[PDB]
Design a protein around this ligand. Structure first.
Ligand code: O0X
Ligand code: O0X
Lengths: 304, 304
Protein backbone atom coordinates (compact mmCIF):
# COMPACT_ATOMS: atom_id res chain seq x y z
CA UNK A 1 0.00 0.00 0.00
CA UNK A 2 0.88 3.68 -0.26
CA UNK A 3 0.65 6.03 -3.22
CA UNK A 4 3.43 8.24 -4.46
CA UNK A 5 4.17 10.46 -7.47
CA UNK A 6 6.35 7.74 -8.93
CA UNK A 7 8.62 8.23 -11.91
CA UNK A 8 9.93 5.47 -14.20
CA UNK A 9 13.43 4.20 -13.33
CA UNK A 10 15.73 6.53 -15.31
CA UNK A 11 18.69 4.23 -16.04
CA UNK A 12 17.85 3.51 -19.67
CA UNK A 13 17.58 7.26 -20.37
CA UNK A 14 20.71 8.24 -18.35
CA UNK A 15 22.75 6.12 -20.75
CA UNK A 16 21.54 8.31 -23.64
CA UNK A 17 22.41 11.75 -22.25
CA UNK A 18 25.19 13.80 -23.81
CA UNK A 19 26.42 17.43 -23.72
CA UNK A 20 26.11 19.48 -26.93
CA UNK A 21 28.03 22.76 -27.28
CA UNK A 22 27.81 25.11 -30.24
CA UNK A 23 29.73 28.36 -30.08
CA UNK A 24 29.17 29.59 -26.53
CA UNK A 25 25.90 27.67 -25.84
CA UNK A 26 25.80 24.33 -24.02
CA UNK A 27 22.75 22.13 -23.51
CA UNK A 28 21.75 18.43 -23.40
CA UNK A 29 21.41 15.99 -26.25
CA UNK A 30 19.81 12.55 -26.55
CA UNK A 31 22.11 9.99 -28.20
CA UNK A 32 20.15 7.09 -29.74
CA UNK A 33 21.85 4.82 -32.27
CA UNK A 34 24.17 7.13 -34.32
CA UNK A 35 22.10 10.27 -33.87
CA UNK A 36 22.14 12.98 -31.19
CA UNK A 37 18.89 15.00 -30.82
CA UNK A 38 18.96 18.43 -29.17
CA UNK A 39 17.00 21.75 -29.22
CA UNK A 40 17.95 23.79 -32.31
CA UNK A 41 18.44 26.94 -30.14
CA UNK A 42 21.91 25.52 -29.21
CA UNK A 43 23.05 27.47 -32.37
CA UNK A 44 21.89 30.83 -30.98
CA UNK A 45 23.60 33.61 -29.04
CA UNK A 46 21.60 35.96 -26.71
CA UNK A 47 21.30 38.56 -29.52
CA UNK A 48 19.53 35.90 -31.65
CA UNK A 49 16.94 34.73 -29.13
CA UNK A 50 14.48 37.68 -29.69
CA UNK A 51 13.54 36.14 -33.07
CA UNK A 52 16.22 33.80 -34.45
CA UNK A 53 16.50 33.06 -38.17
CA UNK A 54 17.36 29.43 -37.51
CA UNK A 55 17.96 28.54 -41.17
CA UNK A 56 20.56 31.33 -41.52
CA UNK A 57 22.14 30.61 -38.16
CA UNK A 58 22.53 26.91 -39.04
CA UNK A 59 24.05 27.71 -42.47
CA UNK A 60 26.99 29.33 -40.61
CA UNK A 61 27.63 26.08 -38.72
CA UNK A 62 29.55 23.05 -39.84
CA UNK A 63 29.76 19.51 -38.36
CA UNK A 64 32.95 20.42 -36.44
CA UNK A 65 31.19 23.34 -34.69
CA UNK A 66 28.91 20.92 -32.76
CA UNK A 67 30.88 19.58 -29.83
CA UNK A 68 29.24 16.45 -28.49
CA UNK A 69 30.61 14.82 -25.36
CA UNK A 70 29.26 11.60 -23.82
CA UNK A 71 30.64 11.77 -20.30
CA UNK A 72 34.36 12.29 -20.89
CA UNK A 73 34.52 11.00 -24.50
CA UNK A 74 34.09 13.15 -27.56
CA UNK A 75 31.75 12.09 -30.37
CA UNK A 76 32.64 12.74 -34.02
CA UNK A 77 29.90 14.63 -35.93
CA UNK A 78 29.54 13.52 -39.52
CA UNK A 79 26.23 15.24 -40.36
CA UNK A 80 23.71 17.77 -39.13
CA UNK A 81 20.13 18.56 -39.99
CA UNK A 82 17.30 20.58 -38.58
CA UNK A 83 13.87 18.93 -38.29
CA UNK A 84 11.26 21.41 -36.98
CA UNK A 85 12.76 22.75 -33.66
CA UNK A 86 15.34 19.98 -33.17
CA UNK A 87 18.79 19.38 -34.56
CA UNK A 88 19.85 15.83 -35.47
CA UNK A 89 23.61 15.37 -35.31
CA UNK A 90 24.74 12.20 -37.03
CA UNK A 91 27.74 10.75 -35.21
CA UNK A 92 30.19 8.05 -36.33
CA UNK A 93 29.40 5.80 -33.35
CA UNK A 94 26.15 4.17 -32.34
CA UNK A 95 25.46 4.59 -28.62
CA UNK A 96 26.23 1.19 -27.10
CA UNK A 97 23.71 1.98 -24.35
CA UNK A 98 20.82 2.63 -26.78
CA UNK A 99 17.76 0.99 -25.25
CA UNK A 100 14.76 -0.24 -27.27
CA UNK A 101 12.92 2.98 -28.00
CA UNK A 102 10.14 4.81 -29.79
CA UNK A 103 9.33 8.44 -30.43
CA UNK A 104 5.75 9.19 -29.48
CA UNK A 105 3.58 12.28 -29.36
CA UNK A 106 1.62 12.19 -26.10
CA UNK A 107 -1.85 13.53 -25.66
CA UNK A 108 -2.69 16.32 -23.19
CA UNK A 109 -3.62 14.82 -19.82
CA UNK A 110 -1.11 11.96 -20.18
CA UNK A 111 1.85 11.66 -17.80
CA UNK A 112 5.56 11.04 -18.19
CA UNK A 113 8.85 11.08 -16.30
CA UNK A 114 11.44 13.79 -16.86
CA UNK A 115 15.14 13.24 -16.38
CA UNK A 116 16.41 16.76 -15.65
CA UNK A 117 20.00 17.13 -16.88
CA UNK A 118 22.77 19.79 -16.94
CA UNK A 119 25.89 19.55 -19.15
CA UNK A 120 24.80 16.08 -20.26
CA UNK A 121 24.70 14.90 -16.63
CA UNK A 122 21.50 13.71 -14.95
CA UNK A 123 20.46 15.66 -11.87
CA UNK A 124 17.05 14.24 -10.97
CA UNK A 125 13.90 12.45 -12.07
CA UNK A 126 10.28 13.43 -11.58
CA UNK A 127 6.82 12.59 -12.81
CA UNK A 128 4.49 15.17 -14.35
CA UNK A 129 1.52 15.59 -16.71
CA UNK A 130 1.23 17.30 -20.06
CA UNK A 131 -1.37 19.97 -19.14
CA UNK A 132 -4.52 20.22 -21.29
CA UNK A 133 -3.01 23.53 -22.55
CA UNK A 134 0.23 21.73 -23.64
CA UNK A 135 2.51 23.20 -21.02
CA UNK A 136 4.30 21.26 -18.29
CA UNK A 137 4.89 22.45 -14.73
CA UNK A 138 8.41 21.08 -14.43
CA UNK A 139 11.58 21.82 -12.50
CA UNK A 140 14.21 23.11 -14.89
CA UNK A 141 17.00 25.67 -14.71
CA UNK A 142 19.21 27.34 -17.37
CA UNK A 143 21.10 24.52 -19.14
CA UNK A 144 18.27 21.97 -18.62
CA UNK A 145 17.28 22.33 -22.32
CA UNK A 146 17.48 19.02 -24.13
CA UNK A 147 16.32 17.08 -21.02
CA UNK A 148 13.66 14.56 -22.04
CA UNK A 149 10.33 13.18 -20.97
CA UNK A 150 9.52 9.49 -21.42
CA UNK A 151 7.44 6.48 -20.44
CA UNK A 152 8.76 2.87 -20.22
CA UNK A 153 6.83 -0.28 -21.12
CA UNK A 154 9.01 -3.29 -20.10
CA UNK A 155 12.29 -2.76 -22.08
CA UNK A 156 11.04 0.00 -24.43
CA UNK A 157 11.46 3.68 -23.75
CA UNK A 158 8.88 5.88 -25.47
CA UNK A 159 10.36 9.37 -25.63
CA UNK A 160 7.62 11.96 -25.73
CA UNK A 161 9.15 15.29 -24.75
CA UNK A 162 12.31 17.36 -25.12
CA UNK A 163 12.57 20.50 -22.96
CA UNK A 164 13.10 23.80 -24.79
CA UNK A 165 11.82 26.81 -22.92
CA UNK A 166 10.53 28.45 -19.82
CA UNK A 167 7.77 30.96 -20.52
CA UNK A 168 7.76 34.29 -18.61
CA UNK A 169 5.05 32.76 -16.36
CA UNK A 170 7.47 30.09 -15.10
CA UNK A 171 5.78 27.22 -16.92
CA UNK A 172 7.57 24.93 -19.39
CA UNK A 173 7.33 24.27 -23.13
CA UNK A 174 8.89 21.75 -25.38
CA UNK A 175 8.63 19.45 -28.34
CA UNK A 176 8.10 15.85 -29.39
CA UNK A 177 11.33 14.13 -30.60
CA UNK A 178 10.56 15.25 -34.15
CA UNK A 179 10.91 18.88 -32.93
CA UNK A 180 7.21 19.79 -33.05
CA UNK A 181 6.18 21.99 -30.11
CA UNK A 182 3.36 20.84 -27.93
CA UNK A 183 0.97 23.79 -27.93
CA UNK A 184 1.28 27.09 -29.80
CA UNK A 185 4.77 27.94 -28.63
CA UNK A 186 7.68 29.08 -30.73
CA UNK A 187 11.36 28.94 -29.78
CA UNK A 188 11.80 32.70 -29.33
CA UNK A 189 12.33 34.91 -26.26
CA UNK A 190 8.86 36.45 -26.42
CA UNK A 191 5.81 36.47 -24.15
CA UNK A 192 3.49 33.74 -25.50
CA UNK A 193 -0.06 32.97 -24.44
CA UNK A 194 -0.48 29.42 -23.08
CA UNK A 195 -4.26 29.54 -23.10
CA UNK A 196 -6.81 28.40 -20.59
CA UNK A 197 -5.79 25.30 -18.70
CA UNK A 198 -8.25 22.84 -17.12
CA UNK A 199 -8.02 20.09 -14.48
CA UNK A 200 -7.75 16.52 -15.94
CA UNK A 201 -11.01 15.05 -14.67
CA UNK A 202 -10.28 11.43 -15.61
CA UNK A 203 -6.99 11.61 -13.66
CA UNK A 204 -8.66 13.10 -10.56
CA UNK A 205 -11.19 10.23 -10.67
CA UNK A 206 -8.35 7.70 -11.07
CA UNK A 207 -6.61 9.21 -8.03
CA UNK A 208 -9.85 9.02 -6.00
CA UNK A 209 -9.94 5.27 -6.87
CA UNK A 210 -6.25 5.03 -5.80
CA UNK A 211 -7.25 6.68 -2.51
CA UNK A 212 -10.00 4.10 -1.90
CA UNK A 213 -7.63 1.23 -2.76
CA UNK A 214 -4.99 2.66 -0.38
CA UNK A 215 -7.43 3.19 2.53
CA UNK A 216 -8.67 6.81 2.22
CA UNK A 217 -12.45 6.58 1.99
CA UNK A 218 -13.91 9.56 3.94
CA UNK A 219 -15.01 11.28 0.67
CA UNK A 220 -17.29 8.42 -0.48
CA UNK A 221 -20.93 9.42 -0.18
CA UNK A 222 -24.50 8.12 -0.58
CA UNK A 223 -24.93 9.88 -3.93
CA UNK A 224 -24.71 9.23 -7.65
CA UNK A 225 -24.78 11.63 -10.65
CA UNK A 226 -25.07 11.48 -14.45
CA UNK A 227 -22.44 12.51 -17.08
CA UNK A 228 -24.66 15.53 -17.88
CA UNK A 229 -25.03 16.70 -14.27
CA UNK A 230 -21.39 16.07 -13.44
CA UNK A 231 -20.35 18.06 -16.54
CA UNK A 232 -22.32 21.11 -15.37
CA UNK A 233 -20.17 21.00 -12.14
CA UNK A 234 -17.01 20.32 -14.21
CA UNK A 235 -17.84 23.43 -16.30
CA UNK A 236 -18.23 25.62 -13.16
CA UNK A 237 -14.94 24.38 -11.68
CA UNK A 238 -12.83 24.40 -14.87
CA UNK A 239 -12.57 20.61 -15.13
CA UNK A 240 -12.41 18.78 -18.48
CA UNK A 241 -15.85 17.42 -19.51
CA UNK A 242 -16.08 13.69 -18.78
CA UNK A 243 -16.94 11.43 -21.73
CA UNK A 244 -17.90 7.74 -22.03
CA UNK A 245 -14.31 7.08 -23.31
CA UNK A 246 -13.02 8.37 -19.93
CA UNK A 247 -15.62 6.19 -18.10
CA UNK A 248 -14.43 3.21 -20.17
CA UNK A 249 -10.75 3.72 -19.22
CA UNK A 250 -11.81 3.95 -15.55
CA UNK A 251 -13.45 0.48 -15.90
CA UNK A 252 -10.64 -1.52 -14.28
CA UNK A 253 -10.54 0.76 -11.21
CA UNK A 254 -14.35 0.70 -10.96
CA UNK A 255 -14.22 -3.15 -11.08
CA UNK A 256 -11.42 -3.33 -8.47
CA UNK A 257 -13.22 -1.16 -5.92
CA UNK A 258 -16.81 -1.99 -6.81
CA UNK A 259 -17.51 1.75 -7.06
CA UNK A 260 -19.45 2.71 -10.21
CA UNK A 261 -17.73 5.52 -12.15
CA UNK A 262 -20.79 7.79 -11.80
CA UNK A 263 -20.86 7.16 -8.02
CA UNK A 264 -17.19 8.28 -7.89
CA UNK A 265 -18.19 11.32 -10.00
CA UNK A 266 -20.74 12.19 -7.28
CA UNK A 267 -17.96 12.06 -4.66
CA UNK A 268 -15.84 14.34 -6.90
CA UNK A 269 -18.83 16.68 -7.36
CA UNK A 270 -19.28 16.98 -3.56
CA UNK A 271 -15.53 17.65 -3.09
CA UNK A 272 -15.63 20.33 -5.80
CA UNK A 273 -18.70 21.98 -4.24
CA UNK A 274 -17.63 21.71 -0.57
CA UNK A 275 -13.86 21.45 -0.60
CA UNK A 276 -11.88 19.12 1.66
CA UNK A 277 -12.95 20.82 4.97
CA UNK A 278 -9.38 20.68 6.30
CA UNK A 279 -8.93 16.99 5.44
CA UNK A 280 -6.48 15.16 3.15
CA UNK A 281 -6.55 12.45 0.49
CA UNK A 282 -3.35 10.46 -0.07
CA UNK A 283 -1.33 13.17 1.71
CA UNK A 284 -2.77 15.96 -0.43
CA UNK A 285 -5.14 18.83 0.52
CA UNK A 286 -6.12 19.40 -3.13
CA UNK A 287 -7.56 17.21 -5.90
CA UNK A 288 -4.60 15.64 -7.72
CA UNK A 289 -4.70 15.27 -11.53
CA UNK A 290 -1.21 13.96 -12.36
CA UNK A 291 -2.06 10.24 -12.22
CA UNK A 292 -3.77 8.57 -15.16
CA UNK A 293 -5.97 5.48 -14.71
CA UNK A 294 -3.06 3.45 -16.20
CA UNK A 295 -0.64 4.98 -13.67
CA UNK A 296 -2.92 4.04 -10.76
CA UNK A 297 -3.27 0.37 -11.84
CA UNK A 298 0.48 0.12 -12.61
CA UNK A 299 1.50 1.52 -9.22
CA UNK A 300 -1.17 -0.53 -7.41
CA UNK A 301 -0.10 -3.80 -9.28
CA UNK A 302 3.74 -3.41 -9.33
CA UNK A 303 4.47 -3.61 -13.08
CA UNK A 304 8.25 -3.72 -13.78
CA UNK B 1 12.25 27.68 -12.13
CA UNK B 2 9.70 25.20 -10.81
CA UNK B 3 9.86 22.90 -7.82
CA UNK B 4 9.16 19.21 -7.87
CA UNK B 5 9.50 16.21 -5.54
CA UNK B 6 12.60 15.13 -7.39
CA UNK B 7 14.31 11.80 -6.91
CA UNK B 8 17.95 11.01 -7.71
CA UNK B 9 18.52 9.36 -11.12
CA UNK B 10 18.18 5.63 -10.37
CA UNK B 11 20.53 4.12 -12.97
CA UNK B 12 23.42 3.38 -10.61
CA UNK B 13 21.04 1.52 -8.26
CA UNK B 14 19.14 -0.34 -11.04
CA UNK B 15 22.41 -2.02 -11.97
CA UNK B 16 22.60 -3.48 -8.44
CA UNK B 17 19.14 -5.06 -8.21
CA UNK B 18 18.76 -8.83 -8.16
CA UNK B 19 16.04 -11.39 -7.30
CA UNK B 20 16.59 -13.62 -4.25
CA UNK B 21 14.44 -16.73 -3.76
CA UNK B 22 14.61 -19.05 -0.76
CA UNK B 23 12.15 -21.91 -0.59
CA UNK B 24 8.87 -20.39 -1.73
CA UNK B 25 9.69 -16.72 -0.90
CA UNK B 26 11.01 -14.25 -3.48
CA UNK B 27 12.18 -10.70 -2.81
CA UNK B 28 14.84 -8.19 -3.96
CA UNK B 29 18.53 -8.15 -3.21
CA UNK B 30 21.24 -5.51 -3.60
CA UNK B 31 24.36 -6.83 -5.34
CA UNK B 32 27.46 -4.74 -4.51
CA UNK B 33 30.91 -6.17 -5.21
CA UNK B 34 30.64 -9.95 -4.44
CA UNK B 35 27.87 -9.62 -1.87
CA UNK B 36 24.08 -9.64 -2.19
CA UNK B 37 22.15 -7.96 0.68
CA UNK B 38 18.49 -8.81 1.28
CA UNK B 39 15.93 -8.89 4.16
CA UNK B 40 16.47 -12.00 6.31
CA UNK B 41 12.70 -12.80 6.19
CA UNK B 42 13.33 -14.31 2.70
CA UNK B 43 14.00 -17.56 4.73
CA UNK B 44 10.50 -17.57 6.25
CA UNK B 45 7.22 -19.23 5.30
CA UNK B 46 3.82 -17.71 6.34
CA UNK B 47 3.69 -20.01 9.42
CA UNK B 48 7.01 -18.45 10.58
CA UNK B 49 6.10 -14.78 10.25
CA UNK B 50 4.13 -14.55 13.58
CA UNK B 51 7.46 -14.72 15.47
CA UNK B 52 10.26 -16.32 13.43
CA UNK B 53 13.27 -17.94 15.07
CA UNK B 54 15.62 -16.60 12.41
CA UNK B 55 18.72 -18.36 13.76
CA UNK B 56 16.98 -21.77 13.57
CA UNK B 57 15.39 -21.04 10.21
CA UNK B 58 18.77 -20.05 8.73
CA UNK B 59 20.50 -23.17 10.13
CA UNK B 60 18.20 -25.26 7.87
CA UNK B 61 19.44 -23.35 4.80
CA UNK B 62 22.55 -23.93 2.77
CA UNK B 63 24.25 -21.75 0.10
CA UNK B 64 22.46 -23.67 -2.70
CA UNK B 65 19.03 -22.87 -1.20
CA UNK B 66 19.47 -19.14 -1.98
CA UNK B 67 18.65 -18.62 -5.63
CA UNK B 68 20.05 -15.30 -6.81
CA UNK B 69 19.28 -14.12 -10.32
CA UNK B 70 20.63 -10.88 -11.86
CA UNK B 71 18.26 -10.35 -14.76
CA UNK B 72 18.44 -13.66 -16.61
CA UNK B 73 21.79 -14.89 -15.19
CA UNK B 74 22.16 -17.00 -12.10
CA UNK B 75 24.69 -16.08 -9.40
CA UNK B 76 26.63 -18.76 -7.54
CA UNK B 77 26.34 -18.47 -3.72
CA UNK B 78 29.51 -19.38 -1.89
CA UNK B 79 28.60 -18.07 1.59
CA UNK B 80 25.76 -16.76 3.71
CA UNK B 81 25.56 -14.83 6.94
CA UNK B 82 22.97 -12.98 8.92
CA UNK B 83 23.85 -9.50 10.23
CA UNK B 84 21.00 -8.07 12.33
CA UNK B 85 17.88 -8.25 10.02
CA UNK B 86 19.77 -8.69 6.74
CA UNK B 87 21.31 -11.65 5.01
CA UNK B 88 24.63 -11.25 3.17
CA UNK B 89 25.05 -13.78 0.40
CA UNK B 90 28.63 -13.99 -0.83
CA UNK B 91 28.67 -14.72 -4.55
CA UNK B 92 31.56 -15.85 -6.77
CA UNK B 93 31.26 -12.81 -9.07
CA UNK B 94 31.65 -9.14 -8.30
CA UNK B 95 28.86 -7.06 -9.84
CA UNK B 96 30.46 -5.35 -12.84
CA UNK B 97 27.94 -2.53 -12.43
CA UNK B 98 28.90 -1.80 -8.79
CA UNK B 99 28.98 1.97 -8.46
CA UNK B 100 31.08 3.85 -5.87
CA UNK B 101 29.05 3.41 -2.73
CA UNK B 102 28.71 3.81 1.02
CA UNK B 103 26.35 2.45 3.64
CA UNK B 104 24.98 5.24 5.78
CA UNK B 105 22.48 5.51 8.59
CA UNK B 106 20.30 8.56 7.92
CA UNK B 107 18.84 10.76 10.57
CA UNK B 108 15.07 11.27 10.99
CA UNK B 109 13.94 14.24 8.90
CA UNK B 110 16.46 13.51 6.12
CA UNK B 111 15.26 12.54 2.63
CA UNK B 112 16.18 9.85 0.13
CA UNK B 113 15.07 8.25 -3.12
CA UNK B 114 13.52 4.78 -3.22
CA UNK B 115 13.80 2.48 -6.19
CA UNK B 116 10.74 0.25 -5.80
CA UNK B 117 11.45 -3.20 -7.26
CA UNK B 118 9.62 -6.54 -7.79
CA UNK B 119 11.41 -9.82 -8.66
CA UNK B 120 14.69 -7.92 -8.92
CA UNK B 121 13.20 -5.60 -11.54
CA UNK B 122 12.82 -1.85 -10.99
CA UNK B 123 9.28 -0.51 -11.21
CA UNK B 124 9.59 3.13 -10.16
CA UNK B 125 11.50 5.81 -8.29
CA UNK B 126 10.26 8.31 -5.74
CA UNK B 127 11.53 10.72 -3.13
CA UNK B 128 10.49 10.56 0.52
CA UNK B 129 11.58 11.49 4.05
CA UNK B 130 12.48 9.34 7.02
CA UNK B 131 9.73 10.50 9.45
CA UNK B 132 10.80 11.74 12.90
CA UNK B 133 9.22 8.49 14.21
CA UNK B 134 11.45 6.37 11.87
CA UNK B 135 8.72 5.20 9.52
CA UNK B 136 8.49 6.04 5.83
CA UNK B 137 5.28 6.73 3.91
CA UNK B 138 6.29 4.85 0.77
CA UNK B 139 4.62 3.02 -2.10
CA UNK B 140 5.35 -0.67 -1.81
CA UNK B 141 3.45 -3.87 -2.55
CA UNK B 142 4.05 -7.55 -1.64
CA UNK B 143 7.42 -8.50 -3.17
CA UNK B 144 8.86 -4.95 -2.82
CA UNK B 145 10.97 -6.11 0.18
CA UNK B 146 14.66 -5.59 -0.44
CA UNK B 147 14.02 -2.36 -2.43
CA UNK B 148 16.46 0.31 -1.26
CA UNK B 149 16.63 3.96 -0.36
CA UNK B 150 19.65 6.07 -1.30
CA UNK B 151 21.18 9.48 -1.92
CA UNK B 152 23.81 10.25 -4.62
CA UNK B 153 26.67 12.73 -4.31
CA UNK B 154 28.38 12.95 -7.76
CA UNK B 155 29.44 9.31 -8.50
CA UNK B 156 28.85 7.88 -4.99
CA UNK B 157 25.66 6.18 -3.93
CA UNK B 158 25.00 6.31 -0.19
CA UNK B 159 22.56 3.50 0.57
CA UNK B 160 20.53 4.33 3.65
CA UNK B 161 17.46 2.10 3.64
CA UNK B 162 16.30 -1.40 2.76
CA UNK B 163 12.54 -2.03 2.79
CA UNK B 164 11.28 -4.80 5.07
CA UNK B 165 7.73 -4.35 6.22
CA UNK B 166 4.39 -2.68 6.02
CA UNK B 167 2.83 -2.09 9.43
CA UNK B 168 -0.93 -2.72 9.88
CA UNK B 169 -1.40 1.09 9.62
CA UNK B 170 -0.10 1.08 6.02
CA UNK B 171 3.18 2.82 6.86
CA UNK B 172 6.61 1.37 6.06
CA UNK B 173 9.55 0.10 8.11
CA UNK B 174 13.00 -0.98 7.22
CA UNK B 175 16.67 -1.11 8.05
CA UNK B 176 20.03 0.45 7.32
CA UNK B 177 22.29 -1.76 5.10
CA UNK B 178 23.73 -3.37 8.23
CA UNK B 179 20.22 -4.73 8.99
CA UNK B 180 19.43 -2.42 11.92
CA UNK B 181 15.80 -1.28 11.89
CA UNK B 182 15.09 2.40 11.93
CA UNK B 183 12.75 2.84 14.89
CA UNK B 184 11.52 0.21 17.34
CA UNK B 185 10.28 -2.26 14.75
CA UNK B 186 10.94 -5.96 14.61
CA UNK B 187 10.61 -8.22 11.58
CA UNK B 188 7.51 -10.07 12.79
CA UNK B 189 3.85 -10.04 11.68
CA UNK B 190 2.62 -8.22 14.77
CA UNK B 191 0.97 -4.86 15.45
CA UNK B 192 3.79 -2.49 16.48
CA UNK B 193 3.49 1.03 17.83
CA UNK B 194 5.26 3.62 15.63
CA UNK B 195 4.99 6.40 18.19
CA UNK B 196 4.08 10.03 17.84
CA UNK B 197 5.22 11.58 14.60
CA UNK B 198 5.90 15.30 14.13
CA UNK B 199 6.25 17.64 11.13
CA UNK B 200 9.90 18.40 10.13
CA UNK B 201 10.02 22.12 10.83
CA UNK B 202 13.39 22.80 9.20
CA UNK B 203 12.14 21.16 5.98
CA UNK B 204 8.90 23.19 5.95
CA UNK B 205 11.01 26.36 6.32
CA UNK B 206 13.32 25.20 3.50
CA UNK B 207 10.27 24.63 1.28
CA UNK B 208 8.92 28.11 2.12
CA UNK B 209 12.31 29.50 0.93
CA UNK B 210 11.97 27.34 -2.24
CA UNK B 211 8.52 28.88 -2.74
CA UNK B 212 9.92 32.42 -2.50
CA UNK B 213 12.76 31.56 -4.91
CA UNK B 214 10.25 30.03 -7.37
CA UNK B 215 7.82 32.99 -7.23
CA UNK B 216 5.24 32.11 -4.54
CA UNK B 217 5.37 34.95 -2.02
CA UNK B 218 1.78 35.60 -0.81
CA UNK B 219 2.57 34.09 2.65
CA UNK B 220 5.37 36.58 3.48
CA UNK B 221 4.24 39.00 6.16
CA UNK B 222 5.31 42.10 8.13
CA UNK B 223 6.16 40.03 11.22
CA UNK B 224 9.10 38.41 12.96
CA UNK B 225 9.27 35.95 15.90
CA UNK B 226 11.86 34.45 18.26
CA UNK B 227 12.94 30.75 18.57
CA UNK B 228 11.09 30.67 21.92
CA UNK B 229 7.82 32.10 20.58
CA UNK B 230 7.93 30.05 17.40
CA UNK B 231 8.52 26.88 19.48
CA UNK B 232 5.36 27.51 21.53
CA UNK B 233 3.43 27.46 18.16
CA UNK B 234 5.45 24.42 16.98
CA UNK B 235 4.45 22.64 20.22
CA UNK B 236 0.72 23.40 19.66
CA UNK B 237 0.84 22.19 16.05
CA UNK B 238 3.03 19.09 16.55
CA UNK B 239 6.06 20.51 14.75
CA UNK B 240 9.65 19.66 15.76
CA UNK B 241 11.17 22.40 17.98
CA UNK B 242 13.49 24.63 15.94
CA UNK B 243 17.09 24.92 17.18
CA UNK B 244 20.01 27.21 16.25
CA UNK B 245 21.53 24.21 14.34
CA UNK B 246 18.41 24.24 12.10
CA UNK B 247 18.71 28.06 11.71
CA UNK B 248 22.37 27.57 10.74
CA UNK B 249 21.54 25.00 8.01
CA UNK B 250 18.91 27.43 6.65
CA UNK B 251 21.67 30.09 6.30
CA UNK B 252 22.25 29.67 2.56
CA UNK B 253 18.52 29.98 1.76
CA UNK B 254 18.21 33.00 4.08
CA UNK B 255 21.19 34.62 2.26
CA UNK B 256 19.75 33.82 -1.20
CA UNK B 257 16.36 35.38 -0.49
CA UNK B 258 17.39 38.04 1.99
CA UNK B 259 14.70 36.72 4.36
CA UNK B 260 15.95 36.26 7.94
CA UNK B 261 15.20 32.76 9.27
CA UNK B 262 13.10 34.18 12.15
CA UNK B 263 11.10 36.30 9.67
CA UNK B 264 10.35 33.09 7.71
CA UNK B 265 9.40 31.44 11.04
CA UNK B 266 6.83 34.24 11.52
CA UNK B 267 5.34 33.44 8.10
CA UNK B 268 5.21 29.74 9.10
CA UNK B 269 3.60 30.70 12.44
CA UNK B 270 0.86 32.69 10.63
CA UNK B 271 0.23 29.78 8.20
CA UNK B 272 -0.01 27.34 11.13
CA UNK B 273 -2.43 29.63 13.00
CA UNK B 274 -4.58 30.68 10.02
CA UNK B 275 -4.18 27.94 7.43
CA UNK B 276 -3.82 28.59 3.70
CA UNK B 277 -7.32 30.17 3.26
CA UNK B 278 -7.91 28.18 0.06
CA UNK B 279 -4.54 29.13 -1.46
CA UNK B 280 -1.54 27.06 -2.58
CA UNK B 281 2.24 27.11 -2.25
CA UNK B 282 4.26 25.35 -4.96
CA UNK B 283 1.15 23.42 -6.06
CA UNK B 284 0.39 22.21 -2.54
CA UNK B 285 -2.51 23.12 -0.19
CA UNK B 286 -0.59 21.88 2.88
CA UNK B 287 2.80 22.66 4.42
CA UNK B 288 5.33 20.30 2.81
CA UNK B 289 8.10 18.76 4.94
CA UNK B 290 9.81 16.34 2.52
CA UNK B 291 12.47 18.76 1.24
CA UNK B 292 15.57 19.43 3.31
CA UNK B 293 17.49 22.72 3.04
CA UNK B 294 20.15 20.77 1.05
CA UNK B 295 17.46 19.43 -1.31
CA UNK B 296 16.13 22.96 -1.97
CA UNK B 297 19.59 24.39 -2.83
CA UNK B 298 20.48 21.33 -4.96
CA UNK B 299 17.24 21.52 -6.96
CA UNK B 300 17.46 25.32 -7.24
CA UNK B 301 21.20 25.14 -8.39
CA UNK B 302 21.13 22.05 -10.69
CA UNK B 303 23.78 19.82 -9.06
CA UNK B 304 24.51 16.70 -11.18
O1 O0X C 1 14.06 29.23 -21.71
C1 O0X C 1 15.26 28.96 -21.80
C2 O0X C 1 16.11 29.49 -22.93
C3 O0X C 1 15.25 29.87 -24.12
C4 O0X C 1 14.78 31.16 -24.27
C5 O0X C 1 13.90 31.48 -25.29
C6 O0X C 1 13.48 30.50 -26.18
C7 O0X C 1 13.98 29.22 -26.04
CL1 O0X C 1 13.46 27.97 -27.15
C8 O0X C 1 14.86 28.90 -25.03
N1 O0X C 1 15.91 28.22 -20.89
C9 O0X C 1 15.38 27.65 -19.71
C10 O0X C 1 14.59 26.50 -19.73
N2 O0X C 1 14.01 25.99 -18.65
C11 O0X C 1 14.20 26.62 -17.50
C12 O0X C 1 14.98 27.80 -17.31
N3 O0X C 1 15.12 28.40 -16.08
C13 O0X C 1 15.85 29.51 -16.02
C14 O0X C 1 16.47 30.10 -17.12
C15 O0X C 1 16.33 29.52 -18.34
C16 O0X C 1 15.58 28.33 -18.48
O1 O0X D 1 5.22 -6.58 5.18
C1 O0X D 1 5.54 -7.40 4.32
C2 O0X D 1 5.93 -8.82 4.68
C3 O0X D 1 6.38 -8.91 6.12
C4 O0X D 1 5.48 -9.22 7.13
C5 O0X D 1 5.87 -9.19 8.46
C6 O0X D 1 7.17 -8.84 8.80
C7 O0X D 1 8.07 -8.56 7.79
CL1 O0X D 1 9.71 -8.12 8.19
C8 O0X D 1 7.69 -8.60 6.46
N1 O0X D 1 5.54 -7.13 3.01
C9 O0X D 1 5.17 -5.91 2.40
C10 O0X D 1 6.00 -4.80 2.39
N2 O0X D 1 5.65 -3.61 1.89
C11 O0X D 1 4.43 -3.51 1.38
C12 O0X D 1 3.45 -4.55 1.32
N3 O0X D 1 2.20 -4.35 0.78
C13 O0X D 1 1.37 -5.38 0.79
C14 O0X D 1 1.67 -6.63 1.31
C15 O0X D 1 2.91 -6.84 1.84
C16 O0X D 1 3.85 -5.80 1.86
Amino acid sequence: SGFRKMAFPSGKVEGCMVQVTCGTTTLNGLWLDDVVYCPRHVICTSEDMLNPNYEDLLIRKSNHNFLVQAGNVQLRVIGHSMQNCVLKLKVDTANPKTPKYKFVRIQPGQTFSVLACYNGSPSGVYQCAMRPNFTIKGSFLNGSCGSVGFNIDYDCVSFCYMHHMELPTGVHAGTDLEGNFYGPFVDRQTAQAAGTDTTITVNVLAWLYAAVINGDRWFLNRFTTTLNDFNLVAMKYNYEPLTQDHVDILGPLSAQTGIAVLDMCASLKELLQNGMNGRTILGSALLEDEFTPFDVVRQCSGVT
